[model samples]
Target: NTIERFTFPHKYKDEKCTICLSMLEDGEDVRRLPCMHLFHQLCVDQWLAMSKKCPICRVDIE
Candidate 1:
């Protein structure tokens, strides 16, 4: 099996994003590093530019 799965699981199928505080819409990119915390691409990019850690879990990226 691949280490990284681009598709969301059925359990997380209809999850909402806490950052934007909205239901996750289809085609809006959802990004998760090895930390496994999901975020919108724009949200994660801004956060990563400021700091190199997962915004929610504080897992180091740098």
Candidate 2:
């Protein structure tokens, strides 16, 4: 399985990276999901390498 990734052009001050439990930055590389969630690329990428679900919703990534 694979993941969708992008460069964050804006900051979601109210949102935290689900994997790192930290705030995000503008222009940060990130992972996005159909579940409408965002996370740090590497952080979530590592998880995705071993699993095939959205980290928060546990929805199948495939």
Candidate 3:
């Protein structure tokens, strides 16, 4: 139950979603998994729907 969606209150250094390689800036919604990995909301949703593992770490999400 650690999955969370958060809106960065300020600018961040990392501006890309490693999952989809999409560019992201401030005000973008990001999904954070228990593994402490970040990804675009839609991108991660599609991935999780098919596989319940972290794309970068390969750790099971649930």
Candidate 4:
């Protein structure tokens, strides 16, 4: 048998982004991955063009 556990960061429940240090605003443009790392779309696009996984979380993207 296998068990899976999940943990939530109390700080991130309503936390602002560390990059801009501002709360994520409605309709703001951002890129996201299965691991939930967020970045400016263009910022990540450039990374994705040269890589097969997310730079932040190393999540595989297709």
Cα lDDT tens digits for candidate 2, 1-62? 34543223233336688677887877677666767778877687767766867778888767
TM-score between candidate 3 and the true structure = 0.67
lDDT of each: 0.59, 0.67, 0.65, 0.49
Please name the candidate that would achieve the greatest TM-score relative to the true structure: 2
Best-to-worst TM-score order:
2, 3, 1, 4
Taking the tens digit of each residue's C-alpha lDDT, what string does model 3 give over 11-39?
23346789778787666766677777777
Clashing pairs in 2: none
State candidate 2's TM-score.
0.73
Off by over 4 Å in 3: 1-13
Residue-wise C-alpha lDDT for candidate 4, range 1-62, written one tens digit per residue: 00011111222215345445666555556655556666544344555555656676676665
Q: Pick by lDDT: which candidate is best?
A: 2
Q: After superposition, how far is residue 43 of candidate 2 from its true place, in Å?
A: 0.8
Candidate 2 Cα errors over 4 Å, as ranges: 4-13
Q: Which stretches of candidate 4 lie over 4 Å from their true place?
A: 1-26
Lowest summed lDDT across 10 adjacent residues in model 2 is found at: 4-13
Q: For candidate 3, give the lDDT of residue 12.
A: 33
Q: How would you encode candidate 1's per-residue C-alpha lDDT over 1-62 as one tens digit per residue? A: 12123322322227667678777777777766666777766555665655666667787754
Q: Score every model by TM-score.
A: 0.65, 0.73, 0.67, 0.49
